């Protein structure tokens, strides 16, 4: 709804949104692995040499 | 693979002193308990004495016929024995070693100590010489 002969103060490096969405994200990320395997098992000694290939 | 680096023989008279060592590699010493003996050409097998790591005291055993003449201390940094002889006999011509126990408990699971693979090495140096 272009509010015509309006002009505001816009600032970014202030935004809170910008704060909001980074929370948002990391927090959804952290939510999709709360149902996987973790991987502690395998914390173990791994002899290892190159590929032959 | 372990090993125990011998080193420091040398040609010596009863009047004088040396010093036998051994470094290890693979091995550290932060908990190995070391013991050297010591066979003398046509002789049988004569414990000198033991050390045990400075982690459990740094407590010292020593064989009465060698006591007090030849001595066993530890570096602690770069893992190397030492055996430390001084004003000896016609008597101590020999070979020495020095000897430890590897052991090694490989455990299948960090919730029971239960089952595991246990493996035992007798590590040897290579042995170096006391002369009169
Ligand atoms: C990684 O090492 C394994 C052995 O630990 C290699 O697998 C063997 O390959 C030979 C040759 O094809 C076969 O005869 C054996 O039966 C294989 N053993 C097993 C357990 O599969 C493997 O090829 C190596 N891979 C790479 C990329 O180097």
């Known amino acids: 709804i272009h509010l015509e002969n309006v002009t505001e103060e816009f600032n970014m490096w202030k935004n809170n949104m910008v704060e909001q969405m980074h929370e948002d994200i990391i927090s959804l990320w952290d939510q999709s692995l709360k149902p996987c395997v973790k991987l502690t098992p395998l914390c173990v000694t791994l002899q290892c040499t190159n590929v032959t290939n | 693979e372990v090993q125990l680096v011998e080193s420091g023989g040398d040609l010596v008279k009863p009047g004088g002193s040396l010093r036998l060592s051994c470094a290890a590699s693979?091995?550290?010493?932060?908990?190995?308990?070391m013991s050297w003996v010591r066979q003398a050409p046509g002789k049988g097998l004569e414990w000198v004495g033991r050390?045990?790591?400075?982690?459990?005291?740094?407590?010292?055993d020593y064989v009465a016929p060698v006591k007090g003449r030849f001595t066993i201390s530890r570096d602690d940094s770069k893992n190397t024995l030492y055996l430390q002889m001084n004003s000896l006999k016609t008597e101590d011509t020999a070979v020495y070693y020095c000897?430890?126990?590897?052991?090694?408990?490989?455990?299948?699971?960090?919730?029971?100590?239960?089952?595991?693979?246990?493996?035992?090495?007798?590590?040897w140096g290579k042995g170096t010489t006391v002369t009169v």
């Open positions: 000897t430890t126990g590897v052991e090694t408990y490989d455990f299948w699971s960090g919730y029971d100590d239960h089952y595991y693979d246990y493996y035992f090495r007798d590590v």
């Open positions: 693979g091995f550290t010493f932060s908990d190995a308990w």
């Open positions: 050390i045990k790591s400075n982690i459990d005291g740094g407590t010292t």
